[PDB]
Amino acid sequence: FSKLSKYVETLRVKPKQSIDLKKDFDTDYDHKMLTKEEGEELLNLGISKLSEIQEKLYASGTKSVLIVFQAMDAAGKDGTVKHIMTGLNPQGVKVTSFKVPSKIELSHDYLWRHYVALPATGEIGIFNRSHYENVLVTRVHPEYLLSEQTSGVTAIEQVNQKFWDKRFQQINNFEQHISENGTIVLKFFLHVSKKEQKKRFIERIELDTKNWKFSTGDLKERAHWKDYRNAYEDMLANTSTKQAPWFVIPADDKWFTRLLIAEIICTELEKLNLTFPTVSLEQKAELEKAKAELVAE
């Protein structure tokens, strides 16, 4: 983990930095410290450690954790969320996968459904797709804004850079408020290359046990790749803060993606210095006494 820990620091997006995904963030790390087999063992320790942290977090009831995932189709997002959940307790973890908004949801501001779904003290909430969709798919297809009664947009011509700027400000305000009121916010962008996306799409199409699930509408979003990259770059450049950071994770090799994310969550949550509750003398005496009754039956 020694070398890996330094590399992980590079994946965080600093507040003042500017973003060029093609040029400066590699979708696949060439100087991988370790073998895939070593990586799998490390990931296994990470999930176990993350599990212990979750238990301490549930037992204290002082903070909540919100973890966000955004990615292009076939970046491994869903599978990564899956792998994390299998390791955790279901009692203090909730996954919400946001999809196209319902009628009721469209009658409220775009943040309302996310605010409603936030994690309570002691629990971890995972957003497999978040409020950031409102500056991503909605920026590429501004026509969706016409179905939002609260957006204030009657024609696509009305939307300019100032509108996305205002949303970035709204989002930053929402995340700063929850950060100041107990929530730890960690955001991950899984960054997959165009080439690798293509290779995964073809693999899915070819497998008779995956292709029932393949949706050809994913191809439409692939054709808007440059539009999405611009949406992603502008968002990362304005919504990553020290309090609520974005991490860009290379997604071309899945085992390495998962390892990176687990390492980063552990490291960030380790700053809370969580411990298990201790047993006091009064509590110790009650336990001994309870044990004495069981023996005397």
Residue ranges binding ligand AMP (CB under 6 A): 98-101, 129, 133-134, 137-138, 144
Q: Do the beta carbons of residue 63 and residue 183 sit within 8 Å?
A: yes
Q: Toward Cl ion, which CB reaches closer, 219 or 285?
A: 219
Cα–Cα distance, 273 to 245 (Å, whole number): 19
Q: Shortest distance, CB of residue 54 to ligand AMP, whole angstroms?
A: 25
In the complex with ligand AMP, the residue whose CB is nearer, 101 or 245, is: 101
Q: Which does 137 bind (CB under 5 to 8 A by kind): Cl ion, ligand AMP, none?
A: ligand AMP
Q: Which is nearer to Cl ion, 183 or 197 (CB)?
A: 197
- Give the Cα separation of 25 and 249 in Å (integer): 9
Q: Which is nearer to ligand AMP, 98 or 112 (CB)?
A: 98
Our CB check for ligand AMP shows the closer of 146 and 202 to be 146
93, 123 in Cβ contact below 8 A? yes
Closer CB to Cl ion, 19 or 43, in the complex: 19
The 10 Å CB-count burial string (b at 16+, else e) for 87-98 is: bbeeebbbbbeb
- Shortest distance in whole angstroms from residue 183 CB to Cl ion: 31
Min dist. Cβ of residue 190 to ligand AMP (A): 13
- CB 66 within 8 Å of CB 185: yes
Residue 129: contacted member of ligand AMP, Cl ion, none (CB under 5 to 8 Å, by partner type):
ligand AMP
Q: Which is nearer to Cl ion, 57 or 72 (CB)?
A: 72
CB of 75 to ligand AMP, least distance (A): 12
Give the residue nearest to ligand AMP (CB).
133
Minimum CB separation from Cl ion for residue 196, in Å?
11
Angle at 91 between CA 102 and CA 42, to 5 degrees: 100
Binding residues vs Cl ion (CB under 5 A): 21-22
Look at residue 133 and give the partner it binds from Cl ion, ligand AMP, none, a contact being a CB closer than 5 to 8 Å depending on partner kind.
Answer: ligand AMP
E strands present in the chain: 64-71, 93-97, 124-128, 183-191, 246-250
Unique residue bearing structure tokens 């775009």: 110
Give which of ligand AMP, Cl ion, none residue 1 binds (C-beta under 5 to 8 Å, depending on kind): none
Under a CB-based contact definition with an 8 Å cutoff, are residues 253 and 72 in contact? no
Q: How far is CA 46 from CA 37, 64, 80, 90, 167, in A?
A: 14, 19, 13, 18, 35
101 binds, among Cl ion, ligand AMP, none (CB under 5 to 8 A by kind): ligand AMP
| Binding partner of residue 119 among ligand AMP, Cl ion, none, CB cut-off 5 to 8 Å per kind | none
22 binds, among ligand AMP, Cl ion, none (CB under 5 to 8 A by kind): Cl ion
CB atoms within 10 A of CB 120: 12
| Shortest Cβ 225–Cl ion spacing (Å) | 7
DSSP state of 183: E
In what side-by-side order are the strands of the sheet with 64-71? 93-97, 124-128, 64-71, 183-191, 246-250
CB 127 → ligand AMP: shortest distance, Å? 10
Rounded distance, CA 62 to CA 181, Å? 10
